[PDB]
Design a protein around this ligand. Sequence first.
Ligand code: HIS
Ligand code: HIS
Ligand code: PZH
Ligand code: PZH
Lengths: 407, 405
Amino acid sequence: MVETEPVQGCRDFPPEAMRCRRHLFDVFHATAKTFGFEEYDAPVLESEELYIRKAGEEITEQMFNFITKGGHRVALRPEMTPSLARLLLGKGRSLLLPAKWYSIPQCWRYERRREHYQWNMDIVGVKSVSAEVELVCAACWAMRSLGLSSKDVGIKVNSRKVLQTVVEQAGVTSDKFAPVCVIVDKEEVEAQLAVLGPTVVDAITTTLSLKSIDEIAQRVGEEHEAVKELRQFFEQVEAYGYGDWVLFDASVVRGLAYYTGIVFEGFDREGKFRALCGGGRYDNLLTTYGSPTPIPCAGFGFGDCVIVELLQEKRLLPDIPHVVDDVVIPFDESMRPHALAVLRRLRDAGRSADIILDKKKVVQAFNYADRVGAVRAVLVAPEEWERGEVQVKMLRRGFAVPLDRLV
Amino acid sequence: MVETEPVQGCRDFPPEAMRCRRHLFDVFHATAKTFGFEEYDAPVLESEELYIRKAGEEITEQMFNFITKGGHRVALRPEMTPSLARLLLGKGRSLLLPAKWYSIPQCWRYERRREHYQWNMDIVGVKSVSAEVELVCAACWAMRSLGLSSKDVGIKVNSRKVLQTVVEQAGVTSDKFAPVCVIVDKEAQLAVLGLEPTVVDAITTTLSLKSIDEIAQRVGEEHEAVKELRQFFEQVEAYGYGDWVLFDASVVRGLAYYTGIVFEGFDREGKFRALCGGGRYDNLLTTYGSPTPIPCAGFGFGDCVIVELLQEKRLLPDIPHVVDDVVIPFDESMRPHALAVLRRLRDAGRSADIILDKKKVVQAFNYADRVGAVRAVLVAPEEWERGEVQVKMLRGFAVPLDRLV
Ligand SMILES: N[C@@H](Cc1c[nH]c[nH+]1)C(=O)O
Ligand SMILES: N[C@@H](Cc1c[nH]c[nH+]1)C(=O)O
Ligand SMILES: NCc1ccc(Br)cc1
Ligand SMILES: NCc1ccc(Br)cc1
């Protein structure tokens, strides 16, 4: 036998498992459409150079990389955001702003799972917190669409600008801010900061432990950018009607080098699962890639695995069996030609329909119809045919119907 | 600057290019649904062992393979069919037959494009030619759905059983039939496999026969291939796609595993490579170690040649992005109210933007036009006090909040 298991850490999606994935992706797509985002895609294979950010990120530590037969350093993308930036930088002046782009790429890692799908939503060319508002509202909308409520989940919201000011007031070089964020994201965090380069660590921990925006304002001032932006953010989400879904949490920084402003992450209010989604503003990324002009950006990722766990726990993922509208059944093999004419008609009318492909008895054909979840069984028999009719039997007992009135 | 071009032989899909791909995939999905096929997927990364068929196939010659950190021989799949067989073999007795499965995997090669998407449709557990009929009809349906006619395209149909009999009558070992097919798909190479001149003569003669009647004269009217091809053409005629299909004795396909009927789509102007290709492969699962033979048939249908053909025929106009509503705050003090409006529009199943940054109404209106909005909803202080907004159709007057949706 060949090996029937998939390659290490990768998932197969037979029809049953595919329907669950599809149910999830339908929401991601529908939510994107509702919010006016445009789909894009790019190759899963990118140059390794795209991910060399040198901040000790977990994501760059766990890259699935390899050398081509030809000697080029490539990787299966660990995330989509750098691919987006490449595309954005490639368009340059021709890209009309603002742009709202989304995708549902498979992303990879090498360390149980080595592979996941990740819905990406990003807004490009919008300076103000309305971008973050929309992004956060989109993530809530998706969760709501899947059956979750604000009692089940929330989004923790913070700004990295608070921590920046604290770090900056200690005379810490600006090039050290990203590593600090990668570290603070994680008693070992006390040791790692010293290595980057005690009273400064004290200050960091104190501010991240502050439990409200008012307490942040006491420390850095009420007119500080972070305070004004967070207040605007919460005012807008309230106005949109999702105030119960969002809250402030000063310990949220995220693990990625490139966030500059507001950052956020989704969570289950039972404290059972890892983050459902995560994102933030990254206004400097395109400048680091070499854009001659700064390009504001903000966005999030939303993985396909944790959400499914949460939906299973909450009993929101019942198996939806396969369905088809009609199953056409030839009474015997001499009726196959006529049955195919019927099948054609049903499909021309926009119906989903099978025809019994092999030779079998009517009752077995009827059973197969039930197994594939047919709403209706269409028996094509000699006597009915002469009368310009077929027999129809609803499965969701039996009578003749004219060919013209089936559809 | 970082490199803005994609990795060698790979395509970017910015929104414009993505809409074209989406238009194509919508047809593949809709056709699958119409025909009652179920979606599946599997990892793009598979074990290299999965593709070692030893017939000198072009597909196994051009594998995108590499060694993991850990020393495992893996590959980016060159095709989906072996992944399907793996899944099928994994299920074994638990899989209810017949099964009709489809997918739209990206597949890879290393040699020019190194990457394409390929719609796969396969029928499992059906012995008779009705499987091939449905598969061929599904491919025609997809092309028809995209705007093509039987004047633009067709499907050439043959059976490998004819060539099998000829090869077999020359005393050629059964294990040589797949290599012979891989070669005939493309004089010197057959001799190397082990065939003398008279056997090559016979091969070429039969592949040059232009009708099923001429095949019957050579191998008999009772021969499996003749009965099956006649049944096949009778069924496609009955389904109403007779103008789309024809017999061509030179069609064998390049893959090792086809055993019976094979087919391929083509443009009737002779400009393009094959649009799609498939056939019956009844032995594949036996070779993977299935304790019982499992009949299978299917096809692949790439995303690149079809698009070329559709561009030539002028069937791929750019469809610009569209959204139903663009909500415009008169100024920043109206943003909260505008968000309440935005919420309502989206709750009602409408696609809607709100102007995110600070800008003047006329510029907001321009942006609305650029993103292809059907309707612009201006949220101004004076209208708001009256429980109203201003609505302007794009593709001006006051409207009550309740009657927008
Ligand atoms: N790339 C981020 C998510 C993101 C998308 N856009 C902005 N941020 C992550 O994987 O965590
Ligand atoms: N694997 C074949 C297509 C196919 C799918 N199923 C059967 N055949 C190809 O790439 O040509
Ligand atoms: N964001 C968590 C996560 C990242 C990568 C993979 Br692969 C799986 C999960
Ligand atoms: N079926 C032709 C083809 C095969 C592989 C790639 Br990649 C592209 C086209």
